[PDB]
Amino acid sequence: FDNSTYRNLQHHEYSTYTFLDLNVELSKFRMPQPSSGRQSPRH
Template identity: 70%
Template sequence: MATSLLRLGRLGSVKRLLRGGWSTPRTPLVAALCTEGDVPPKTAKASVKKQAPEPEPEPFDDTTYKNLQHHHYNMYTFADVDVALSKYRLPQPSSGRVSPGP
């Protein structure tokens, strides 16, 4: 086995392993040596359970929906919120030195 793998090269050995070259042999001889059958005895078919009918959907009333914050975005939304929240903004910390900018 090893010489055949060496003769085929690296790719050939990978192909041989992927094909199941070192797996257990699937011959009738192995099946004859087994003491236990791996096929379970057949059981009666389970009866098909009937599903309960789906309940009717509840009526949907969208006239009382008040959460409009997700629906009224426009081009100036960010600027409007920025101006409205500017009174809560804290000043930027400074080191006390004059900045070198122009």
């Protein structure tokens, strides 16, 4: 057990598209979205 080490070093490797890449990967587990019945409020 060590409490003198900072382990949060992963973000030192995060690129420009890391957040969006994670969003793309997570798009697979999502539940189907609900619908309001229109394509848009202007439809």
